[PDB]
């Protein structure tokens, strides 16, 4: 019943910054705890009854609070710290858990690296067309992607996923993928990939000709 | 070297039952209480049960009555009976060793998760797709229409390390699909050859399929 709120959800720290995170308590709890999830990983604990380090924990990592309010502090902030970060609350209740903060770190501005697909023969020989676009290692996160047939733009039958920030060099990475018929794609010729990021003000383009 | 490896998980009709299971090595078992704590598909963290020392159990009201939590102290493993199932219940389920000196209490080494999924679609294999098109060059391979997830995807049987990368499955009504790519050199391929090895667990599914060029 003690609801945790944490602030904000998302933030973002250049390196070599000081950081602090806020975990708000709906009544008095006695102790609190934080952990880090990094992208692919299981929860990872760092600080215990409030203001503890964990064994193993690098010295930057700081806890503090009491009452209803807590925060975690990261003194000097490192790219392998991306990550996010929960508040779990001792009571005589315990266990309810915060929803996290979700911390990425600042870096140079990378253009994406574009690269189409045109479907595979093993795909169309059962009447099917998967297009498939990548657009890997950029930063900043928000980028779109436009989809052209034969020069017209095309909206339905189109899915994006993204990755989470990568721990290694810290940029981000995307897919989009274009599902059609075998009939549908071969009453056209022309497949486009058009990614806008603030890296550049025209757009990236890589593109196919059906029959080249 | 203190380990946790869960098992158990997989796809259940909703009102079925499953029994995970979690194998602990590298410190004395029995001398630790432990819980299980679980990951929606959301990522909101949500304890489960916990066993502490003594024998004592409990559990949050969500799932009393349904849940059951215990110990084997002989080979060291660590049990939850999930029974009566809905569909809320699917997760990520971890089980953790909780931290012994503390005021109050927390869970100081987690294991890697085992994945449940409580459904009434059906079980289906991926369709594997090879994706081939400068001094660096990007293949990949596209994973099409599975249930549940997870799937697991490498590349020269783990060989290739960086220059991979895979994306999150996205769902479609029923099916997942997902996409995973790699970088090699201009001058790698194509005279070696790359390979996807894409593992379902679920169905009982591992293909390898080539990446040749056109
Ligand atoms: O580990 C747990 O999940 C439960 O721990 C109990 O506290 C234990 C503690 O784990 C031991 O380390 C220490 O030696 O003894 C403590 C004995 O209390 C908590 O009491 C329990 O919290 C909740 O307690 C309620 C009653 O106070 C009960 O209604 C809840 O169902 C229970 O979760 C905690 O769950």
């Known amino acids: 019943q003690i609801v945790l709120t944490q602030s904000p959800a998302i933030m973002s720290a250049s390196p070599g910054e000081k950081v602090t995170m806020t975990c708000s308590a709906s009544?008095?709890?006695?102790?609190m705890y934080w952990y880090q999830q990094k992208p692919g990983s299981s929860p990872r604990l760092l600080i215990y009854d409030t203001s503890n380090l964990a064994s193993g924990v690098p010295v930057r990592f700081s806890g503090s609070g009491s009452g209803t309010s807590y925060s975690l502090t990261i003194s000097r902030m490192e790219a392998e710290d991306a990550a996010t970060y929960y508040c779990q609350q001792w009571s005589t209740y315990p266990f309810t858990f915060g929803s996290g903060t979700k911390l990425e770190i600042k870096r140079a501005d990378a253009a994406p690296t574009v690269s189409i697909f045109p479907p595979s023969s093993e795909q169309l020989t059962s009447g099917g067309a998967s297009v498939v676009c990548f657009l890997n290692n950029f930063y900043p996160k928000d980028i779109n992607v436009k989809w052209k047939i034969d020069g017209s733009e095309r909206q339905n039958g189109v899915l994006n996923s993204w990755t989470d920030q990568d721990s290694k060099d810290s940029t981000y990475s995307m897919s989009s993928t274009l599902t059609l018929t075998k009939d549908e794609y071969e009453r056209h010729n022309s497949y486009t990939c058009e990614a806008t990021h603030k890296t550049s003000t025209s757009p990236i383009v890589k593109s196919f000709n059906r029959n080249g | 070297e203190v380990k946790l490896v869960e098992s158990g998980g997989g796809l259940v009709k909703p009102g079925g039952s499953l029994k995970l299971s979690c194998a602990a090595s590298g410190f004395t078992f029995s001398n630790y209480a432990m819980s299980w704590v679980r990951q929606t598909p959301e990522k909101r963290l949500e304890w489960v049960a916990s066993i502490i020392i003594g024998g004592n159990t409990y559990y949050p009201d969500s799932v009393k009555g349904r849940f059951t939590i215990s110990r084997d102290n002989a080979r060291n493993i660590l049990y939850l009976q999930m029974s009566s199932l809905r569909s809320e219940d699917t997760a990520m389920y971890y089980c953790?060793?909780?931290?012994?000196?503390?005021?109050?209490?927390?869970?100081?080494?987690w294991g890697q998760g085992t994945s449940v999924t409580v459904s009434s679609a059906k079980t289906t294999p991926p369709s594997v797709y090879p994706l081939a098109p400068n001094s660096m060059v990007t293949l990949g391979c596209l994973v099409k229409g599975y249930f549940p997830e997870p799937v697991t995807v490498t590349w020269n049987s783990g060989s290739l390390s960086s220059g991979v990368h895979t994306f999150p499955a996205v769902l479609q009504s029923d099916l997942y699909t997902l996409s995973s790519s790699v970088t090699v050199p201009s001058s790698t391929w194509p005279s070696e050859t790359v390979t996807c090895n894409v593992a379902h667990p679920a169905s009982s599914t591992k293909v390898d399929k080539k990446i040749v060029p056109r």
């Open positions: 009544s008095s709890v006695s102790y």
């Open positions: 953790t060793r909780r931290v012994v000196v503390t005021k109050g209490g927390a869970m100081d080494y």
